[PDB]
């Protein structure tokens, strides 16, 4: 018996269809999960529309964290009264049967739903712009001195369609969250869009979250994770191949840099040593983004040759972009302000 029955042995509630709560939400269906626990489709009969209602798990440590992301949604939504800045709107929250449930706006489907339905055959490059001017632009939100916010954990998944016809989005799941002061966790960020900081177990900063969009924007338009490491070491290496060795500086402030490289006598940085002739991983560098993109020969896999809005031009705007976003150095990594100037956001 789990909290009397209400719960299952994983600390979530065990939801149930037509169920209706404190004589206000008609309970829909579940529609999401997480570590968080579960996201459930509701009827407000009092206000009278539709919401998505977190439910918490119930567990002290999960608790806590939700605690957290609820004083960041309402610091957010308290500067974005207006809702134009791409972020979630917390209606309201309140405990039942001992899970904390989070009240909000009812959304449409995530970028990753939007990505199978083509197949993984990618989204334009003009809609692929659309998503990246947004979220530049809510980043540049989240980096207002009074609110300096790291979402810690974006990826597809937590970008949403505000309706399915339309290119308006909205970040989701600031449950992983942090502000600039109060940084907790060492192990963060989803893995495929994890950065090399975090990785190497060094400090981080916002900066964080644009190394993560970059990796987001590439698979919007080629269909695939750009970095889709298995475990840590297989991140490092992938990132590896395409961007080379990080800098000397770097690693040589990075407490888990001999997790994936060997500092040589004179002083620079190899990949660790590999086995018996294995060979598992192309050279560093070779992996050249203007081959994964495709810019001189169709887009990706070529999929693009000869449509409007995909010339040479705008592939080699939208590499540089991604490539300033990719930037081994936390401290000149492309910021929202300079990413908006960009000559790939040009009217
Ligand atoms: O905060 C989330 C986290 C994780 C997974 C799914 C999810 N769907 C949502 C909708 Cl429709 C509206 C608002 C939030 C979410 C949400």
């Known amino acids: 018996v789990y909290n009397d029955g209400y719960d299952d042995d994983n600390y979530d509630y065990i939801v149930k269809n037509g169920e209706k709560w404190m004589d206000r939400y008609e309970i829909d269906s579940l529609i999401g999960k997480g570590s968080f626990g579960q996201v459930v489709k509701a009827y407000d009969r009092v206000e009278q529309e539709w919401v998505a209602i977190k439910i918490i798990k119930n567990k002290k440590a999960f608790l806590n964290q939700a605690q957290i992301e609820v004083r960041l949604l309402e610091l957010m939504n308290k500067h974005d009264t207006e809702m134009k800045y791409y972020i979630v709107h917390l209606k309201r929250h309140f405990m ?207 999929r693009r040759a000869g449509e409007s809005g995909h010339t040479v031009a705008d592939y080699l705007k939208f590499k540089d972009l991604i490539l300033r976003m990719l930037d081994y150095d936390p401290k000149t990594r492309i910021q929202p302000y300079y990413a908006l100037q960009h000559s790939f956001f040009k009217k």
Not at 183 to 189: C, G, K
Not at 236 to 261: C, S, T, W, Y
Not at 272 to 298: A, C, F, M, S, W
Request: with cysteine.
């Open 96 to 302: 039942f049967r001992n899970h904390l449930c989070l009240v909000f706006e009812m959304l449409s489907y995530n970028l990753y739903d939007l990505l199978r339905n083509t197949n993984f055959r990618g989204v334009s490059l003009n809609l692929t712009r659309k998503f990246a001017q947004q979220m530049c632009t809510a980043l540049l939100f989240l980096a207002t001195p009074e609110l300096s916010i790291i979402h810690c954990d974006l990826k597809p998944e937590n970008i949403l369609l505000c309706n399915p016809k339309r290119s308006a989005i909205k970040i989701v799941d600031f449950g992983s969250s942090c502000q600039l002061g109060q940084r907790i966790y060492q192990y963060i960020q989803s893995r495929f869009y994890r950065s090399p900081e975090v990785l190497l177990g060094m400090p981080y900063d916002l900066a964080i979250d644009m190394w993560s969009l970059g990796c987001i924007l590439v698979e919007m338009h080629t269909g695939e994770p750009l970095f889709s490491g298995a475990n840590e070491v297989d991140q490092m290496n992938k990132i590896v191949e395409v961007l080379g060795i990080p800098p000397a500086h770097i690693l040589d402030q990075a407490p888990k840099a001999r997790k994936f490289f060997e500092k040589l006598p004179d002083g620079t940085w190899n990949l660790k040593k590999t086995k018996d002739g294995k060979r598992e991983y192309k050279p560093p560098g070779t992996r050249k983004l203007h081959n994964i993109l495709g810019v001189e020969t169709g887009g990706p896999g070529g």
